[PDB]
Design a protein around this ligand. Structure first.
Ligand SMILES: [Cl-]
Ligand SMILES: [Cl-]
Ligand SMILES: [Mg+2]
Ligand SMILES: [Mg+2]
Ligand SMILES: [Mg+2]
Ligand SMILES: [Mg+2]
Ligand SMILES: [Mg+2]
Lengths: 195, 222, 226, 212, 125, 196, 204, 233, 195, 196
């Protein structure tokens, strides 16, 4: 799919993902949720080739849920992101690689810290204060570089995110039909239903 | 580079009547601008009152007919000599064709017979196994020359009753086996005139409750 | 297409089938492939049909003007030289493959010419998709000192071989006989071995079968007086 | 090719055209583009005719095995996912499929899944697939409401295919209508486009551009 | 070299006469008599073969010329001028008509083409 | 094609097969590949038939106009005219020509003009697809100042072998003899040369 | 991509007893998209009728070109051009663009005003004349038209019988072609009256 | 997938009243090089069948070994190997046709065109064709490669349809075959003068003729042919 | 450029043309007027390859203005559309053809009739009640086929045009930044400044 | 490469040049192309050096194992093993091999295995790029039942001409004589064969 953004603030991680699904000529859907909850305090958004995105995401979700049941324990965001990176790094030298880029937003309950990981389809992982995939970073990073502070509140993060989406809506040629925004913090994952 | 496919020309035609069915085909086999044979049978009695033709690349055509005839034989072995119904044969041929989905039989298949109510039946297949029961179907080289004529003369398309001027359609009255054979012969005579791959001879297999009968007619040899 | 040329005692004969095709479809069932360059110089064309016609008519036009200029009856070697130099200049892009035959004050002549501009002399020649079928017959039955009747027979038999065996050829045989000291005789549809049989059914419709929306008279006449 | 399916108060309307073409040549005007998976599930044909026929009949067999084993009707979610997981295994091999898996169960209500040969599986309210999809979407989008009656919804599906059949060269022949209820689908007939066009033109006053 | 006479050699005199055309007509007047008569079912054109010498073979000098199979021409005046006009007339019947319509031009239109050629020698440089 | 020209005591002889192919089809089995560009200057043609005919016709025209102005041209002059056409139009031509002629001052001379348009004066020359198979034979058997009968045998035997191995060569062996006595045409049929 | 099947359309011509008929569909498209249902492909210059299938821009250009040329013809000849003469003019005009041709399939129909003889002719895009006694076909459904005409046609049909034959030939051919249809016109031509009829047909 | 290297040209054949005739020249070409001059391309199987092969010679030699093995195998535990359970032309063909189609289906064809000529147990004539694609067909006359274009037209003038077969004697048939071989020698650049001819007759059995030559050739007319248009000398 | 629509109603012709100009990655402008007035009662909108569109349009404008001055007379919409078709038909066999598609909306003052002509870059001309270029027709023609009447008012035409633009904004993947709408009638050409 | 094998009265002789090229560079000017697969069964190798060495090593292994079990193999058997490798691996090999051997029962025998993997038993065989130029010469000069000295001269003269015209051939002419008397190696230098 198209635009996926992430921003790690003081106490939470915020993931914004576009709602459009376009199959060539027509926009088939304008309410698509490009995300999966891997564990109560870990969320993964995704974009890439059709079919492979959801297939990969649900495969990861199934594996993390299996780990959670076996050990009666939630893996740290770092551990989950390492597992995901290895799957993609394995995939890139497969017969047919997963063409999927992901952002992993998690709240580490042990360290009491939000964490944002950016991983592309090659298995390139980086921990960032804010990230994106595709062309999304080209339009938004100059705004994030200017305004971002590590001590921002969740509300300030959402306001900076709105400015980023506004710049995307102005200068991007494609109509991505707005974004679904989700917040990951100590209490878990919730969706901002008005954005 | 080796090309595993070829084109042996030929044209086939299946028409379903009220209590009969005909499957016809020309007997000419060709490659490029040469004639291989003026009489190479293309429509086959496969047993159980079913007739079949797989037109296009003759090697794939012969292979498919052979494997279907074999399927009829084993259907009898495995299911207490039960008669293979035309609908069951059609579904079976889909699986034979789709089995080579990624290296297809380069043929257009048509089978004809009677359904389980004794009514005439024709089934038509694409190279990879999509199929449908049809009333009228031409296949192969001169299919584009024959089908419009059949639309007009079998289904009475674009024909309206005189005096009404387009308000009342010409009613779809049932055709006899003699009437169908006339339209088949005229279809192939016309196709022979305008298509270089059609000619030499016409062989028609007629299916009724009494069994399978054959009729042969000369076509122009130029 | 099948075209042949055959030399005989006192002249030359050319022949051709009458089928023209786009791909596998027969466009015309009674095509005229024997073209007149001048009264006693005729040729038959294979390949691109417009090119064989156009190149014939151009050289035929220039041959007529040359004949008037020189006060002499045209020569086959002149037609040949003008054809080949024209075709060579266009490097095969004019797809005209011709068999050129005729009689003139010098005698009787038979040449073939290919689209690139290469020419051939011979007593018997064949061109087109059915040329191998025709040449098989010519190589089996040709001899020196053929009579007029024998040459017409051989030529038409060679065309028949093309008609029956080559899918690119069909329908009828056209012949043109050019004899020294005589008018060239063009025998259109010399053989007709492919008449269609009577159809099983008449397809004449009842009047009023077709649905009509509007009728109107079309004015084909010029603006009227008064 | 034009196929559509939309959810509404009374269930699902499925409407398709009937034309199959090979280049400019019209191969058939009598193609069955709705595939009766079982008495409760319908699938639409677009892309490859064989791929859709073969694998959606196969789907019917899997659905039958599921309900024999689990003693319960398969969900539309589960049924659509069996098909999407299957075609995803073949991804890259050249399958061609764009289908709507339509059903109406107790736990889900009326449900439509767009399933596609590159592995896409989308739940939605309105889907339209084929060469004439854009024409049918126009009529659908401007007239669709959730509270349509079964009668009006059936006509809307019919009228949307007609719009596509008129403008899209590769759509036409006849219109097939289905209405999917919780107790199963109900067939609502074959409608020749030639006769339908004139009928709709006169009764509706539309297509003033066309002389009749 | 190059033809540096790009100006008209025939021009209007004060009295409105085109001298060179008048003088050309004077040359025609000196020429041997030729005539034409139209009948209901044909036309005849005739002239005298004024042989310049008895040693000359006057059959090799054609004063009456075929232009097309259905059109003929005869002249009075300068023979060489006639001969080149016949060559141009025969060619123009093909280039401007037969190669376009696949048939020979009607008499009046071929006459028109010949007339145009003669008009141009009256105005061209 | 198998062609060759051989100088000998009394002048020069040109030799050629008669097969012209379109792929594997023999379009003409009785071709005349020995071409007259002047009374006693001939050539053997190989490569594109259209090209070599076009070239030869232009050369014949040039030498005819030369003769009207300056009298009989030398064989060297004829070769030069061939070379000029072949070299200047090398991008658009596929022609391999052997030029052979008889002067009274120079006697028999042979020039070969291969694909590039270069000129090479030689005692004898071989060309065409069939020539490859007789390089060994011709080198071993050629002598200078042979008699007419010896040279006819040398060419007959050489082209016999070229025809035997090369599918593109065949038919009759044609020869043209150029001497002070005049121009003589010779022909040898399969039943003669196949038993050699 | 193929210029002769971008816009679509068909023309058919037939001879009858002391009459000729020429007919065409009305569709203009951009491949799959139907653009116009009023694009007539038959024109006339005096009593000579010309149908043109193929690339629509060339159809329009050639009509304008032949109007141009037949108008000058008439001024100079002092008479209307005949079908036989016009056929040669079409051939000449097409062949002059031998290596950059108009992508068209022209069809001539008419009756010679002096002999009264019915005349029809067809051309390929490069000027080759097909002068058939019976019928001429052209367009994206030419195969279908060949099939219809070959079975439906019989010689010496009266004007009102010829109308039914040519109409049914066009209609049923067009219904088996995606790029033809959207209406149809039939001209029935006699020595000094021409009738034009628009046919009712399916609009898909 | 490969390319043919050493190749054999046309195989020609026809039916006559009491049997079949088949012929093929003795050349193994290497492109345009006429490399091998003593190659037998007609291979008899028993006394009732002759298999004629054109195309790739290495594949021909492989097929020859398959047929040799087929005879050995048929004789195993078979008391009637020289009687009722001998190999029929139809058995030999069907086996080859199976192999050919299987090989093309693995994208590794035997690069050949094959004609199986023979006489069945009941005296019926057998003549059928199979090639590298597994395509099969039967006709009163059959020919491969150039023979298809030049021999068939001539042979079809003798037997034009099924009803002409009983009217055609072995003398007329052999004459037609021999003439066709001459025509092919005139016109096929990959042919040779030397050929083999086999007759399988229901009365006189298998007659295999080796070292035949094309004779009665017309070449004399070549002496009058000069230049390519205007040349007189 | 992208979407250009045209509709001929009772007494006027209405042309709607998108405002976006996109150079690959970024939308450079969102207020572009893709139209030229050829004469007081004739308007031409255009879309196609960059540069060529404006170059062609201004070239046509210059020619029609020249004709108007020379003859002191306004050419009919039919005459202008024929001139434009010939230029494009000439262009398609040029060394480098104009890649420009146009709609010509004019009011014929002699006949007192609005006229809409659609001409593509090949020189394919058709007179229509409503037309489009590119993919615009694929989304809008089903709506126009349904609602169009030849006796519609200008206001009803604008309302039907709004429904067409709404359907484009819903199902088209590209953001064309709305449309500029212009009306051509007996009084000349005017722009609807709120749409 | 120029290679040949010739049967004669007392057995068979193999001959070869010694030039191995990489493009126009002579990578080895003293190559030994005559290879021993058994005591009195040798071969001449042409084509890919890697391929023909690999094949010859496998054949030598096969004939060594054959000999341990069944005694001395025939020349036909050796040719069959070569053919099996060349035919079954035709897609991946570029090898043209001439097999020559001496039995006491069969005497001298020559088999040629060209690119396709077919086998041809011949009185003599020629192969390699240089062979094209000596088809005419060898056909004209070969006789059956020659003496040892005549066969050495025939091969020396033949390969001399092949070397003269083929740039890919050159160096020394190597020969191996196979008779009842045993195995004899011969070598002939440029100064000897160039003056022939
Ligand atoms: Cl050289
Ligand atoms: Cl070899
Ligand atoms: Mg035919
Ligand atoms: Mg050239
Ligand atoms: Mg449609
Ligand atoms: Mg030879
Ligand atoms: Mg249609």
């Amino acid at each position: 799919m198209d635009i996926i953004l992430g921003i790690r603030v003081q106490d939470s991680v915020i993931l914004a993902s576009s709602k459009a699904v376009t199959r060539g000529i027509s926009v088939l859907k304008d309410s698509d949720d490009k995300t999966r909850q891997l564990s109560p305090h870990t969320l993964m958004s995704f974009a890439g080739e059709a079919g492979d995105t959801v297939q990969f995401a649900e495969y990861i979700q199934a594996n993390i849920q299996l780990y959670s049941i076996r050990e009666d324990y939630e893996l740290s965001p770092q551990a989950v992101s390492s597992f995901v990176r290895q799957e993609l790094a394995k995939s890139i030298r497969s017969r047919r690689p997963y063409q999927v880029n992901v952002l992993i937003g998690g709240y580490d309950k042990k360290k009491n810290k939000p964490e944002l990981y950016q991983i592309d389809y090659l298995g390139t992982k980086v921990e960032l204060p804010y990230g994106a995939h595709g062309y999304s970073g080209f339009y938004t990073f100059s705004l994030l570089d200017h305004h971002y502070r590590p001590d921002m509140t969740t509300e300030e993060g959402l306001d900076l995110l709105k400015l980023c989406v506004q710049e995307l809506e102005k200068r991007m040629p494609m109509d991505f039909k707005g974004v679904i925004v989700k917040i990951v913090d100590k209490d878990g994952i919730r969706q901002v239903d008005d954005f | 580079q080796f090309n595993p496919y070829g084109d042996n020309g030929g044209t086939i035609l299946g028409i379903a009547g009220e209590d009969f069915a005909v499957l016809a085909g020309d007997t000419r086999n060709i490659t490029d601008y040469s004639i291989n044979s003026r009489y190479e049978p293309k429509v086959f009695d496969c047993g159980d009152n079913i007739v079949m033709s797989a037109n296009g690349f003759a090697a794939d055509g012969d292979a498919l007919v052979k494997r279907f005839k074999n399927s009829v034989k084993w259907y009898h072995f495995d299911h207490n000599d039960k008669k293979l119904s035309i609908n069951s044969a059609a579904r079976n041929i889909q699986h034979l064709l789709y089995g080579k989905r990624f290296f297809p039989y380069y043929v257009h298949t048509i089978i004809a017979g009677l359904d389980e109510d004794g009514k005439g039946a024709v089934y038509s297949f694409d190279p990879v196994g999509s199929y449908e029961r049809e009333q009228c179907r031409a296949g192969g080289a001169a299919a584009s020359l024959i089908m419009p004529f059949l639309d007009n003369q079998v289904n009475f398309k674009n024909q309206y009753e005189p005096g009404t001027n387009g308000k009342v359609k010409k009613p779809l009255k049932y055709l006899s086996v003699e009437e169908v054979i006339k339209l088949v012969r005229d279809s192939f005579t016309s196709a022979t005139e305008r298509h270089i791959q059609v000619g030499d001879g016409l062989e028609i297999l007629i299916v009724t409750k009494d069994g399978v009968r054959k009729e042969f007619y000369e076509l122009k040899r130029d | 297409t099948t075209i042949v040329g055959v030399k005989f005692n006192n002249g030359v004969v050319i022949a051709a089938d009458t089928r023209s095709t786009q791909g596998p479809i027969v466009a015309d069932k009674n095509c005229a492939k024997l073209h007149r360059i001048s009264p006693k110089i005729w040729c038959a064309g294979a390949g691109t049909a417009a090119d064989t016609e156009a190149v014939t008519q151009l050289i035929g036009s220039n041959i007529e003007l040359h004949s008037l200029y020189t006060s002499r009856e045209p020569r086959v070697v002149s037609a040949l030289q003008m054809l080949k130099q024209h075709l060579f200049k266009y490097q095969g892009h004019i797809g005209a493959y011709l068999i050129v035959a005729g009689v003139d004050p010098t005698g009787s002549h038979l040449f073939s010419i290919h689209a690139n501009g290469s020419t051939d002399v011979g007593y018997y020649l064949s061109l087109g998709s059915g040329s191998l079928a025709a040449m098989a017959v010519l190589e089996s039955h040709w001899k020196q000192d053929l009579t007029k009747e024998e040459a017409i027979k051989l030529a038409s038999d060679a065309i028949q071989a093309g008609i029956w065996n080559d899918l690119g050829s069909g329908s009828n045989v056209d012949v043109c006989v050019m004899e020294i000291g005589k008018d060239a005789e063009y025998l259109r549809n010399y053989l007709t071995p492919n008449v269609r049989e009577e159809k099983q059914k008449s397809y004449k419709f009842p009047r009023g079968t077709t649905a009509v929306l509007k009728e109107s008279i079309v004015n084909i006449c010029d603006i009227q007086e008064e | 090719t034009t196929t559509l399916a939309f959810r509404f108060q009374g269930g699902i309307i499925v409407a398709v055209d009937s034309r199959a073409t090979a280049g400019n040549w019209v191969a058939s005007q009598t193609v069955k583009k709705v595939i009766e998976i079982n008495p409760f599930l319908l699938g639409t044909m677009a892309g490859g005719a064989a791929d859709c026929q073969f694998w959606e009949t196969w789907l019917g067999s899997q659905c039958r095995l599921h309900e024999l084993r689990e003693k319960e009707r398969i969900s539309v979610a589960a049924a659509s996912k069996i098909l999407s997981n299957l075609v995803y295994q073949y991804k890259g091999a050249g399958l061609s499929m764009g289908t709507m898996i339509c059903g109406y169960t107790r736990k889900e209500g009326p449900t439509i899944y767009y399933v596609d040969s590159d592995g896409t599986r989308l739940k939605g309210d309105i889907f339209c697939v084929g060469s004439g999809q854009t024409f049918a979407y126009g009529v659908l989008d401007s007239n669709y409401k959730w509270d349509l009656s079964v009668e009006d919804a059936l006509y809307l599906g019919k009228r949307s295919i007609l719009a596509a059949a008129h403008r899209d060269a590769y759509s036409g022949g006849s219109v097939n209508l289905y209405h999917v209820t919780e107790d199963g689908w109900i067939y609502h007939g074959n409608h020749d486009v030639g006769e339908l066009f004139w009928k709709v033109k006169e009764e509706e006053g539309s297509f003033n551009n066309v002389i009749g | 070299m190059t033809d540096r006479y790009s100006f008209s050699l025939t021009t209007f005199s004060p009295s409105g006469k085109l001298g060179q055309i008048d003088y050309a007509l004077t040359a025609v007047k000196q020429g041997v008599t030729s005539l034409g008569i139209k009948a209901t079912n044909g036309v005849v054109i005739a002239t005298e073969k004024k042989s310049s010498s008895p040693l000359a073979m006057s059959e090799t000098l054609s004063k009456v010329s075929l232009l097309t199979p259905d059109i003929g021409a005869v002249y009075s005046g300068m023979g060489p001028d006639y001969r080149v006009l016949v060559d141009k007339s025969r060619k123009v019947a093909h280039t401007s008509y037969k190669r376009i319509y696949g048939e020979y031009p009607p008499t009046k239109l071929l006459v028109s083409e010949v007339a145009k050629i003669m008009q141009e020698a009256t105005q061209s440089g | 094609t198998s062609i060759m020209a051989v100088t000998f005591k009394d002048g020069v002889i040109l030799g050629a097969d008669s097969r012209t192919t379109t792929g594997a089809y023999i379009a003409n089995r009785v071709t005349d590949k020995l071409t007259r560009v002047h009374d006693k200057i001939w050539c053997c043609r190989s490569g594109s038939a259209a090209d070599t005919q076009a070239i030869a016709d232009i050369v014949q025209y040039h030498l005819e106009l030369y003769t009207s102005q300056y009298g009989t041209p030398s064989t060297e002059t004829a070769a030069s005219v061939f070379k000029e056409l072949c070299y200047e139009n090398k991008d658009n031509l596929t022609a391999g020509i052997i030029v052979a002629g008889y002067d009274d001052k120079n006697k028999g001379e042979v020039y070969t003009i291969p694909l590039g348009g270069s000129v090479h004066k030689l005692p004898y020359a071989i060309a065409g697809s069939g020539s490859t198979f007789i390089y060994g034979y011709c080198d071993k058997n050629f002598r200078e100042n042979m008699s007419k009968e010896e040279t006819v045998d040398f060419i007959k035997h050489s082209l016999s072998q070229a025809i035997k191995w090369d599918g593109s060569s065949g038919g009759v062996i044609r020869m043209v003899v150029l001497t002070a006595a005049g121009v003589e045409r010779l022909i040898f049929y399969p039943d003669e040369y196949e038993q050699l | 991509s193929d210029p002769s099947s971008i816009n679509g359309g068909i023309v058919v011509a037939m001879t009858g007893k002391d009459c000729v008929a020429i007919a065409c569909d009305l569709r203009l498209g951009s491949q799959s998209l139907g653009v116009s249902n009023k694009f007539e492909k038959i024109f006339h210059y005096g009593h000579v009728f010309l149908g043109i299938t193929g690339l629509a821009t060339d159809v329009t250009t050639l009509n304008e070109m032949f109007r141009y040329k037949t108008n000058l013809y008439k001024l100079k000849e002092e008479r209307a051009i005949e079908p036989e003469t016009f056929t040669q003019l079409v051939s000449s005009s097409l062949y002059e663009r031998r290596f950059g041709p108009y992508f068209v399939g022209p069809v001539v129909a008419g009756i010679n005003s002096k002999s009264g003889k019915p005349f029809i002719a067809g051309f390929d895009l490069i000027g080759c004349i097909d002068e058939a006694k019976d019928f001429i076909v052209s367009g994206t459904a030419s195969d279908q038209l060949f099939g219809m005409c070959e079975s439906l046609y019989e010689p010496n049909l009266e004007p009102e019988d010829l109308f039914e034959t040519i109409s049914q030939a066009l209609l049923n051919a067009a219904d088996r072609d995606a790029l033809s249809g959207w209406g149809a016109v039939v001209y029935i031509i006699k020595k000094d009256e021409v009738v034009k009829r628009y046919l009712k047909m399916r609009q898909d | 997938t490969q390319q043919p290297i050493v190749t054999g040209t046309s195989v020609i054949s026809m039916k006559y009243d009491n049997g079949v005739i088949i012929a093929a020249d003795n050349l193994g070409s290497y492109g345009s090089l006429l490399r091998f001059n003593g190659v037998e391309r007609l291979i008899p199987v028993g006394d009732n069948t002759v298999v004629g092969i054109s195309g790739d010679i290495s594949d021909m030699q492989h097929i020859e070994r398959l047929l040799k093995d087929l005879v050995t195998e048929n004789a195993y535990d078979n008391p009637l190997a020289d009687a009722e359970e001998a190999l029929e032309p139809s058995y030999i063909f069907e086996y080859l046709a199976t192999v050919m189609y299987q090989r093309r289906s693995k994208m590794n064809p035997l690069w050949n065109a094959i004609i199986v000529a023979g006489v069945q147990s009941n005296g019926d004539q057998f003549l059928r064709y199979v090639n590298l694609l597994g395509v099969t067909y039967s006709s009163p006359t059959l020919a491969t490669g150039f023979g298809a274009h030049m021999a068939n037209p001539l042979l079809r003038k003798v037997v034009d349809r099924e009803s002409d077969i009983p009217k055609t004697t072995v003398q007329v048939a052999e004459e037609a075959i021999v003439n066709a071989m001459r025509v092919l020698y005139y016109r096929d650049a990959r042919s040779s003068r030397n050929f083999s001819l086999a007759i399988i007759d229901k009365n006189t059995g298998l007659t295999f003729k080796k070292n035949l030559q094309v004779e009665n050739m017309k070449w004399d007319f070549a002496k009058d042919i000069k230049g390519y248009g205007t040349q007189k000398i």
